[PDB]
Design a binder for this molecule. Structure first.
Ligand code: HEM
Length: 365
C-alpha cells in the first residue's frame, strides 16, 4: 500500500509522521508529486484557491472558482446550523430503528452490516428529501451504478431523481432539492440538482460509516472515553471532534495541482506538479495539539483538517458531527454493556474505500 493510504491500526503510518512537511517524490530527471504532512502546509495548500486547482454537473470537488463558487453558493444555504438541528429528530429515529435491530440480533452482531452501513444513507436520503417509502431502492440503485458491469443502470437513479426534482419544482417542500428550487427554480438545471444529489450521497456515506465503526472500536479499546457520551452534549461534542481528528477517516482530499510556481517555505511546488495532503498525518501534528498520538475526548476542540480547509470545506461537517454524536450517545444508552465479541480479532478493515473503516465488527450486547 502507498504511505498515505497505509494505516497502522487506528493510527496512520509512522513514516508519514516522520516525513518532511512537504515531501518531494520525483520520477524522472520529471513527474514531481508532493505530499503535505503537516497542519500548516496542508492549510496553505488547500487554502490557496488562487494558485492551486482541483480540476482533473455536480461534484463540487472537481470544480475551481468561479464555477465552484456559483455551484456551492446554491447548495450551501441548506447546511446551516439550525437547518441541521432540525434534522436531529429524524437522525435520532433513523438510528433508534437500527439500535432496535441490534436487540433483535442478540449479542454476536456485525454493527457494520447492521448499523454503520445503514444510518448514513438514511440520514442523507432525508436531507435530500427522499420519501421513506421509496428509499432502499434509491440507495440500492446508487450501489448498483458502482458496477460492483457496464450493465449498471444508473439511468434509473437519474429518472427517479429527475421525477423527485420536477415534483419538488411544482411543489417546493422540505429537502435540499426543494430549497434550491424555491430560490432558483429554472435557473438550477436538472443535471445540476442531480449531480448535487449524487455528490451528497457519495460523500456522507463511507465517511460517516467509517467513523461509526472505527469510533466504537476505539471507544471500546479505550473505555475511559465512553464517559464523554454519558453526560453533557458539550462533553459529547468535544468527543466527536476528538474522534474525527484521531481517526481522520479520509486519507487525503482531492489532489491539488499548482497553477503557478508556489513557494512553500524553503521549497517550491512548480506549475503542474501535484500535492497530496495527508489529512491523517496533519491531524497528528504536535503543532495542532499536544500529545497528538493520544485519544483524549477531554481535549478542547481544535481546527483539524479532517473536514478540509478553504472553499471546499465539508458542506456536511455539522451534519457529520450531529449524525455521529447522537449515535454514540444512544449506542451507549441502549447497549450500555457493549464490548468486543472477539477481543482477539484482527479488526477487519476497509482498505478499498477512499475512507478508512471496519469491514466487519462484532459486538456483545
Ligand atoms: C453527511 C455527511 C457528509 C456530507 C453530506 C459531506 C459533503 C461534502 C461535500 C459536498 C463536500 C464538497 C465541498 C465542496 O467541494 O464544495 C465535502 C468535502 C469534504 N468532506 Fe465531506 N461530507 C460529509 C461527511 C464527511 C466526513 C465525515 C468527513 C471526514 C471525516 C468529510 C470530509 C470531507 C473533506 C476532507 C472534504 C474536502 C475534500 C476536498 O477538499 O477535496 N466529509 N463533503
Amino acid at each position: 500500500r502507498p504511505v498515505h493510504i497505509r494505516r497502522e491500526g487506528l493510527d496512520p503510518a509512522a513514516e508519514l509522521l516522520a516525513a518532511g512537511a512537504l515531501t518531494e517524490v520525483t520520477v524522472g530527471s520529471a513527474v514531481t508529486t508532493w505530499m503535505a504532512t503537516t497542519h500548516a502546509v496542508v492549510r496553505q495548500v488547500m487554502g490557496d484557491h488562487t494558485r492551486f486547482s482541483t480540476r482533473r454537473v455536480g461534484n463540487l470537488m472537481d470544480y475551481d472558482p468561479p464555477e465552484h463558487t456559483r455551484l456551492r453558493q446554491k447548495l450551501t444555504p441548506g447546511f446551516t446550523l439550525r437547518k441541521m438541528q432540525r434534522l436531529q429528530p429524524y437522525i435520532e429515529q433513523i438510528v433508534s430503528e437500527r439500535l432496535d435491530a441490534m436487540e433483535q440480533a442478540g449479542s454476536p452482531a456485525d454493527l457494520i452490516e447492521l448499523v454503520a452501513n445503514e444510518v448514513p444513507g438514511a440520514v442523507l436520503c432525508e436531507l435530500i428529501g427522499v420519501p421513506r417509502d421509496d428509499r432502499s431502492m434509491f440507495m440500492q440503485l446508487c450501489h448498483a451504478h458502482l458496477d460492483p458491469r457496464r450493465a449498471a443502470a444508473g439511468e434509473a437513479f437519474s429518472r427517479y431523481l429527475l421525477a423527485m426534482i420536477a415534483r419538488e419544482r411544482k411543489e417546493p417542500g422540505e429537502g435540499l432539492i426543494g430549497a434550491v428550487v424555491a430560490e432558483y427554480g429554472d435557473e438550477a438545471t436538472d443535471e445540476e440538482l442531480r449531480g448535487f444529489c449524487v455528490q451528497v450521497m457519495l460523500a456522507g456515506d463511507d465517511n460517516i460509516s467509517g467513523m461509526i465503526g472505527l469510533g466504537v472500536l476505539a471507544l471500546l479499546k479505550h473505555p475511559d472515553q465512553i464517559e464523554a457520551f454519558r453526560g453533557d452534549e458539550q462533553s459529547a461534542q468535544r468527543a466527536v471532534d476528538e474522534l474525527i481528528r484521531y481517526l481522520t477517516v479520509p486519507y487525503a482530499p482531492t489532489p491539488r495541482i499548482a497553477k503557478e510556481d508556489v513557494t512553500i517555505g524553503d521549497q517550491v511546488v512548480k506549475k503542474g506538479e501535484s500535492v497530496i495532503c495527508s489529512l491523517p498525518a496533519a491531524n497528528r501534528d504536535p503543532a495542532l495539539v499536544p500529545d497528538p498520538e493520544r485519544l483524549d475526548v477531554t481535549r478542547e476542540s481544535v481546527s483539524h483538517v479532517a473536514f478540509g480547509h478553504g472553499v471546499h470545506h465539508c458542506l456536511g461537517a455539522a451534519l457529520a458531527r450531529l449524525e455521529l454524536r447522537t449515535f454514540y450517545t444512544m449506542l451507549w444508552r441502549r447497549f450500555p454493556t457493549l464490548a468486543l465479541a472477539d477481543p482477539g480479532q484482527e479488526n477487519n478493515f476497509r482498505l478499498t474505500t477512499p475512507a478508512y473503516g471496519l469491514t466487519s465488527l462484532m459486538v456483545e450486547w
